[PDB]
Amino acid sequence: LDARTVMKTGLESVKSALRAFLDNAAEDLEKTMENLKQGQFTKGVTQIINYTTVALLPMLSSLFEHIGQHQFGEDLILEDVQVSCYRILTSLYALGTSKSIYVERQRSALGECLAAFAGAFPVAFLETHLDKHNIYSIYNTKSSRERAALSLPTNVEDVCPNIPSLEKLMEEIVELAESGIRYTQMPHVMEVILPMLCSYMSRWWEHGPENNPERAEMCCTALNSEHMNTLLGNILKIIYNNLGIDEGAWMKRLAVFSQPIINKVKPQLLKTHFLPLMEKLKKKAATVVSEE
């Protein structure tokens, strides 16, 4: 799929087709919300769940990962597509934070779908205090009266209440590295959040004022490269704990999801940060894990 020229000049019914596909995938996710809330148990609604966990998560994952690869998040999703994908975000984060035994055996697909979603999204959904700086923001597009005419909560914190801000997420990350407790008692973060964290980090890394010095204090994302390095090091600490707790392959999938971050990290940053990582790995050499 490529859709840039379709978005600029194309058939209106064709555009309506993609809008219908996207918001249908969103309402299906909403139905999964309602079903698992009424009962965590996962025959029509069961068939809907099967459709979801077999194709809908894969199709959306592929769609948004491809959108990110081709840099298409800035044209496809502007008007009410942001609303549908905010429903999608709330839904997928709800699965990623759910404690259901049923949601567990598709949690691996959940993690790769959440990262793919966060890998491509038109606005920085974790920069609420500076999301006004983005003109692409649905609030900026809808101004005030249209924002009211649409079922828009008028606050970005209000359209994403459940998912914490970037600051809350990163303070959670640092206290998690302080804790270093085992994956079973904390599954959620290192199964879904860290992948989507890294995807968001890559998505708005260039938007960080260190990367674009111009238009600072005006940047939508107040991203920091030292913050990036701290997130990576926190991942390293918790991954040493994972290697000590016999880990699984979910952490290998974490490593391959975070490979782009350890690619954007600098060579002077590579030294004295990964040589430690290889020496931790090689003192715990009895690991199937292949870092880098």
Binding site: L1, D2, R4, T5, H70
Partner: protein, 48 residues
């Protein structure tokens, strides 16, 4: 077929038609898009 899906009779004038579709055309679509990914992906951004 939605009525026939939950019904007993799966016999249709288009039975062999949908069988040929699912067994040939859809795999044909898969392999064809796989072979010509770049042709579709080309959007005047200087690929191919």
């Amino acid at each position: 077929f939605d009525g026939g899906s939950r019904g007993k009779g799966e016999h249709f004038p288009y039975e062999q038609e949908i069988k040929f579709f699912a067994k040939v055309v859809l795999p044909l679509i898969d392999q064809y898009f796989k072979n010509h990914r770049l042709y579709f992906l080309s959007a005047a951004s200087r690929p191919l």
